[PDB]
Design a protein around this ligand. Sequence first.
Ligand SMILES: *[C@@H]1O[C@H](CO[C@H]2O[C@@H](C)[C@@H](O)[C@@H](O)[C@@H]2O)[C@@H](O[C@@H]2O[C@H](CO)[C@@H](O[C@@H]3O[C@H](CO[C@H]4O[C@H](CO)[C@@H](O)[C@H](O)[C@@H]4O[C@@H]4O[C@H](CO)[C@@H](O[C@@H]5O[C@H](CO)[C@H](O)[C@H](O)[C@H]5O)[C@H](O)[C@H]4NC(C)=O)[C@@H](O)[C@H](O[C@H]4O[C@H](CO)[C@@H](O)[C@H](O)[C@@H]4O[C@@H]4O[C@H](CO)[C@@H](O)[C@H](O)[C@H]4NC(C)=O)[C@@H]3O)[C@H](O)[C@H]2NC(C)=O)[C@H](O)[C@H]1NC(C)=O
Ligand SMILES: *[C@@H]1O[C@H](CO[C@H]2O[C@@H](C)[C@@H](O)[C@@H](O)[C@@H]2O)[C@@H](O[C@@H]2O[C@H](CO)[C@@H](O[C@@H]3O[C@H](CO[C@H]4O[C@H](CO)[C@@H](O)[C@H](O)[C@@H]4O[C@@H]4O[C@H](CO)[C@@H](O[C@@H]5O[C@H](CO)[C@H](O)[C@H](O)[C@H]5O)[C@H](O)[C@H]4NC(C)=O)[C@@H](O)[C@H](O[C@H]4O[C@H](CO)[C@@H](O)[C@H](O)[C@@H]4O[C@@H]4O[C@H](CO)[C@@H](O)[C@H](O)[C@H]4NC(C)=O)[C@@H]3O)[C@H](O)[C@H]2NC(C)=O)[C@H](O)[C@H]1NC(C)=O
Lengths: 210, 209
Amino acid sequence: GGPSVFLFPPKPKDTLMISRTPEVTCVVVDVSHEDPEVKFNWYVDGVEVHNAKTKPREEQYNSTYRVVSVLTVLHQDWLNGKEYKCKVSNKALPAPIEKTISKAKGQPREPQVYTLPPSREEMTKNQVSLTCLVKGFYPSDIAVEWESNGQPENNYKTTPPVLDSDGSFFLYSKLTVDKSRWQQGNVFSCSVMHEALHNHYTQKSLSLSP
Amino acid sequence: GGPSVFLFPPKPKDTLMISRTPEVTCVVVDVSHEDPEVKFNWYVDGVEVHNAKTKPREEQYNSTYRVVSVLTVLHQDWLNGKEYKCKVSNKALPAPIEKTISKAKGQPREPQVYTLPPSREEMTKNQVSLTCLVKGFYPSDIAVEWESNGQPENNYKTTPPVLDSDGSFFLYSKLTVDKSRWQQGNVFSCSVMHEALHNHYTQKSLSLS
Ligand SMILES: *[C@@H]1O[C@H](CO[C@H]2O[C@@H](C)[C@@H](O)[C@@H](O)[C@@H]2O)[C@@H](O[C@@H]2O[C@H](CO)[C@@H](O[C@@H]3O[C@H](CO[C@H]4O[C@H](CO)[C@@H](O)[C@H](O)[C@@H]4O[C@@H]4O[C@H](CO)[C@@H](O[C@@H]5O[C@H](CO)[C@H](O)[C@H](O)[C@H]5O)[C@H](O)[C@H]4NC(C)=O)[C@@H](O)[C@H](O[C@H]4O[C@H](CO)[C@@H](O)[C@H](O)[C@@H]4O[C@@H]4O[C@H](CO)[C@@H](O)[C@H](O)[C@H]4NC(C)=O)[C@@H]3O)[C@H](O)[C@H]2NC(C)=O)[C@H](O)[C@H]1NC(C)=O
Ligand SMILES: *[C@@H]1O[C@H](CO[C@H]2O[C@@H](C)[C@@H](O)[C@@H](O)[C@@H]2O)[C@@H](O[C@@H]2O[C@H](CO)[C@@H](O[C@@H]3O[C@H](CO[C@H]4O[C@H](CO)[C@@H](O)[C@H](O)[C@@H]4O[C@@H]4O[C@H](CO)[C@@H](O[C@@H]5O[C@H](CO)[C@H](O)[C@H](O)[C@H]5O)[C@H](O)[C@H]4NC(C)=O)[C@@H](O)[C@H](O[C@H]4O[C@H](CO)[C@@H](O)[C@H](O)[C@@H]4O[C@@H]4O[C@H](CO)[C@@H](O)[C@H](O)[C@H]4NC(C)=O)[C@@H]3O)[C@H](O)[C@H]2NC(C)=O)[C@H](O)[C@H]1NC(C)=O
């Protein structure tokens, strides 16, 4: 049919905290039933390391399969822009398909975090909007979360990174809360994880004036 | 590789202003010399229509032809859900290729437009940012703009639309200006164009106070 490959980068959060594990997925689509014999081969700066592991395919319920491999990586490795090449061999595919990825190039720029109170003209509604504006950062790989009293709030959405005119990125994070718990003077905070921050983590709190 | 067809919708602003001309564009690529002929058939909710406008072939440096057909649509036909289908036929295709576009099926929701003054903390750079918050709208087709004193303020960026948890949409627009204005009580206004806003427009002013 049409076995094409797709290489994906690790998650931003995973390369910043050594607690978690950053990976490179090498998803191969449209695998034929006939010859489902797909092989993999990794290269770290064309050095070919060994440690990756494969997975059990699935049925794309459209007469095709979908194999996918994943290779673990060192946090500093990936951060220092090394290359990750994933070659997808095959016994029934024209030739050796390949793809490579690495982190965006350029000097990391430190994000500037600001929290914004909900507009008074929203006080009427039953729920208000807490706003976290993260701008001026490079590269765009970033993570955002909101919390309260150490506990993690989950009713929020974050717009993806947007290229600014100066070449850095920005985004907004919106947290939704019952108007009541905002007048009570509760405290909410925006957390931003990024390689350019000291200790890869910054936090700016948001609360009511009186 | 046989011909490929891509269907494009009109621009959001185009469908909200009776003065604009909303168009749906059917583009065809990868048409070799062996069979350069292409036929276009248009359907509006299934009934074939013939008011299109098809431009003639156009070579593409890669030895393949590109053909494009344009269909003008009525503002209300669009805002009302009508579906447009483009059938492309090529003497080298097993079967004709068809594509269909429309306004996302749903029920329009009026967008909430709030403005936000900059954070006191950011008040330390030669530039500041005024925020425009637009939430609770559907469908996601929208348009945002900033202007101060009638004139258009061009140094801004709008985030793309983000699906909220209630199913509606929201976005943020950022207007970056010199703190050497904001401090001088200047007034900035954020305008939004959407199908669910009376007269398809609304405006919110942000001022220093
Ligand atoms: C049969 O059915 C198949 C499967 O069906 C599914 O899909 C539809 C058909 C749907 O209707 C359902 O039926 C069903 O859901 C179907 O396969 C599909 O084929 C498509 C065509 O090839 C594939 O499209 C590609 O998608 C890429 C993006 O993939 C991500 O996003 C999709 C959509 O959300 C998602 O489905 C994928 O899973 C994938 O998500 C990411 O996945 C990785 C790996 O798991 C995650 O990362 C890991 O996560 C773990 C978590 O534990 C951990 O954190 C690890 O650290 C981490 O690594 C991510 O989290 C996850 N992210 C997200 C957001 O979800 C596209 O990139 C790709 O686009 C490129 O190629 C296009 C042409 O092919 C081109 O037009 C396009 O422009 C683009 O090209 C690139 O452009 C860039 C800039 O724009 C440039 O920078 C590049 O240079 C340039 N490159 C190239 C080569 O051009 C492409 O569109 C689709 O993914 C695939 N679906 C599935 C489910 O596999 C098949 O087509 C059907 N067959 C037939 C005949 O119909
Ligand atoms: C041979 O050469 C051909 C010519 O290419 C030349 O390009 C030059 C730039 C240069 O590189 C030359 O050297 C080169 O020769 C080449 O043709 C190209 O083929 C590509 C495919 O291989 C086409 O790619 C598709 O592009 C789509 C978007 O195209 C628009 O945006 C690009 C910029 O990124 C622009 O270049 C295009 O021309 C096009 O512009 C839009 O045009 C429309 C109509 O003209 C405008 O609309 C009108 O605008 C006016 C304003 O005056 C007015 O407002 C009207 O009202 C309005 O209607 C748009 O404004 C304009 N947009 C912009 C930004 O300018 C992609 O969407 C498409 O991706 C889709 O398909 C992929 C699969 O391949 C898939 O991976 C991807 O996810 C996506 O799928 C869609 O996903 C959606 C979900 O998000 C779904 O909703 C959709 O249903 C789903 N669709 C499908 C089908 O699945 C794809 O990447 C490329 O456009 C084309 N180039 C041109 C100029 O047409 C050819 O390939 C070459 N062949 C070979 C063998 O080399």
